Amino acid sequence: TCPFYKKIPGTGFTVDAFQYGVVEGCTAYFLTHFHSDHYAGLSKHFTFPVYCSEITGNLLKNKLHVQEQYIHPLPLDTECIVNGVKVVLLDANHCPGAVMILFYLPNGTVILHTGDFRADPSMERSLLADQKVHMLYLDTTYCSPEYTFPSQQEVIRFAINTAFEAVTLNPHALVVCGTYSIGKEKVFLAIADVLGSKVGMSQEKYKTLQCLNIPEINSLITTDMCSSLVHLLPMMQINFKGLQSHLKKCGGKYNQILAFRPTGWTHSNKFTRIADVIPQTKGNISIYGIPYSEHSSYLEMKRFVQWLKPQKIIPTVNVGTWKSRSTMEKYFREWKLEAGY
Numbered sequence: 001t002c003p004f005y006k007k008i009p010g011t012g013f014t015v016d017a018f019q020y021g022v023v024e025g026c027t028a029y030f031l032t033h034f035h036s037d038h039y040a041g042l043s044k045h046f047t048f049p050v051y052c053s054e055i056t057g058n059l060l061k062n063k064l065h066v067q068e069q070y071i072h073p074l075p076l077d078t079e080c081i082v083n084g085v086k087v088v089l090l091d092a093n094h095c096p097g098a099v100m101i102l103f104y105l106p107n108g109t110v111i112l113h114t115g116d117f118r119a120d121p122s123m124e125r126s127l128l129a130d131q132k133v134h135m136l137y138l139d140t141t142y143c144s145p146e147y148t149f150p151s152q153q154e155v156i157r158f159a160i161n162t163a164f165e166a167v168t169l170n171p172h173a174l175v176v177c178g179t180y181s182i183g184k185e186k187v188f189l190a191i192a193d194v195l196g197s198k199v200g201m202s203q204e205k206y207k208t209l210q211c212l213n214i215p216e217i218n219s220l221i222t223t224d225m226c227s228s229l230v231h232l233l234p235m236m237q238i239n240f241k242g243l244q245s246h247l248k249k250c251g252g253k254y255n256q257i258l259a260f261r262p263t264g265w266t267h268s269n270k271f272t273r274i275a276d277v278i279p280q281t282k283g284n285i286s287i288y289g290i291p292y293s294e295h296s297s298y299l300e301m302k303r304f305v306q307w308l309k310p311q312k313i314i315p316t317v318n319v320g321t322w323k324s325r326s327t328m329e330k331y332f333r334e335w336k337l338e339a340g341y
């Protein structure tokens with residue numbers, strides 16, 4: 001049945017709750033972002049109001065064929081009224097179109113639902129600074145101190161420098177990047193820009209990117225694989241067998257592959273700096289796993305919460321085991337005692 005952490009008290013609202021059939025009492029279904037664990041259940045047969053960003057609404061119409069009459073896009077950073085309740089959508093610094101949601105309850109309570117997010121100090125100067133938040137529905141994906149990772153900027157610098165060196169040494173090397181959802185576009189777009197190529201991809205993936213309001217996108221992507229030396233493939237194909245196969249398909253235009261797998265966290269992070277990352281190599285194929293995250297590190301999460309000072313925290317991630325829930329609750333108390341709230 002729908003879990004409590006997907007319901008907003010004192011309203012008829014749910015968040016990212018599309019796989020439970022008709023949730024009894026629900027007058028408006030909010031969707032924070034277009035990732036499958038969150039939209040699971042939507043289709044052209046859905047006949048309740050969906051509230052989301054413009055970009056998530058483009059994807060709902062074009063990719064899942066949700067009928068337009070049920071899509072309610074809201075602009076960001078703008079006080080809106082939904083079924084008599086003031087709400088605001090904020091940038092979540094996750095994937096394109098991803099938002100957090102501020103609810104202003106008729107009784108005076110204010111609730112923030114982070115959706116999936118990567119906390120940033122820039123959030124401390126949004127409309128969040130303007131009033132107190134009583135309850136926080138928190139993306140706790142990496143809520144444990146082992147989860148450190150570098151800035152997105154440091155990761156993209158490593159990727160750009162590695163790709164540029166490789167192709168300048170061997171003008172017959174092909175660069176391949178994995179994907180299985182929206183998000184992490186900067187990885188392949190940054191590499192294509194430094195090499196003076198467009199990124200080549202499948203028609204399905206091309207259609208998905210054309211829904212994202214990215215500036216000058218017609219200039220950066222293409223479905224003509226022959227004219228491109230950065231190819232995007234399913235993440236499943238980023239292994240030695242899949243890459244050898246793809247190389248055969250290119251008809252001897254290329255004699256080497258340099259491939260990137262943008263993972264979240266991997267336990268090479270506890271020890272290894274970004275400067276010291278190495279690939280796995282077999283023959284003329286090298287694969288780099290790079291720690292490009294769209295979720296908060298532990299420290300980023302902690303800073304956000306200690307700045308916000310909520311009265312109650314409700315985790316939305318890693319809630320399925322008693323040891324995980326108990327561990328998170330211990331961190332929340334440490335943070336509260338250290339900061340004084």
Ligand code: NI
Nearest residue numbers: 033035094116
């Ligand atoms: Ni997500």
